[PDB]
């Protein structure tokens, strides 16, 4: 298959800043990926942010910013209030070289 791993629960900041690393592993060695943050609203889905970047290059997005080092993306999200206590899913898409790959994280949980 394809593997995406993200922390089970994170504790957000006193200013609304939550961060953690999302990790992917695959059969290939891809050079262009799209990392997408989603929020699970009980049974629906929201695109929090997304960025198509290439390896080495800037992870350019917004209320999100990012840096990748290998297959780890240090995802930073600023401005989350106590009302955002919900599930944040890490979606990773490997664009090039072919083939495309989809991996979806088991979930990460933020508390504010």
């Amino acid at each position: 298959a394809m593997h995406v791993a993200q922390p089970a629960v994170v504790l957000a900041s006193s200013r609304g800043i939550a961060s953690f690393v999302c990790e992917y592993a695959s059969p290939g060695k891809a050079t262009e990926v799209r990392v997408t943050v989603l929020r699970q609203a009980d049974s629906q889905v929201t695109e929090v942010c997304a960025a198509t970047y290439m390896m080495g290059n800037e992870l350019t997005f917004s209320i999100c910013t990012g840096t990748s080092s290998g297959n780890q993306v240090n995802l930073t999200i600023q401005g989350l209030r106590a009302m955002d206590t919900g599930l944040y899913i890490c979606k990773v898409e490997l664009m090039y070289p072919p083939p495309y790959y989809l991996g979806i994280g088991n979930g990460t949980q933020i508390y504010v």
Partner: antibody
Amino acid sequence: QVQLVESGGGVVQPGRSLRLSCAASGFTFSHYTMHWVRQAPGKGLEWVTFISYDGHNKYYADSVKGRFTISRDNSKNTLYLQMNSLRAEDTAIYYCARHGWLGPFDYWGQGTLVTVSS
Amino acid sequence: EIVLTQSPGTLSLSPGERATLSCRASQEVGESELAWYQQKPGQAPRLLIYGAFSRATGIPDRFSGSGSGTDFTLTISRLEPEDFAVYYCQQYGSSPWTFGQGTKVEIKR
């Protein structure tokens, strides 16, 4: 409601071209990658092509590699399939389909018939 | 390409019975990478279930999926009249997106 509406289907002579278009409405078309999937008469569903929300990433089924190009216009909420060098086996109902944010094709137009024949 | 193969071609059941349809991958597909679609004659197909436990909007809970790796199944716990149709599986974890060749659920009489 999400609604997808294909146009431009009809009869084509082998080796000639045809451009289908899909008119999207009811969602932020700008926000979704889109696909074409086709169905030859009597047979199953065959994926044809993929286009990312911004048009930077495309993928094609090998049976249409080189002959089809996908495109979209976001100002018009329209997805396009440009089919060149058509052959009898490209005869099918062509569906336009939205790639759901979680993996599958969650919304399908009702399809347009493309008949390649002399 | 990940080739998907379905079984049986036609499943013959009476309303109220339970239907188990099969989908087989040529490679190991992740349980959360499969989708099922329903199609009725002359209509576009629509999405039923996908992922490991997820279900598309308005699909009822008699529709449910399982299986790991190579052998997947769609269970229709109690067949309603509106459920006699053709069903297609599809994997969406890697490209190309590939479909099974369909299983018809026909009324046995």
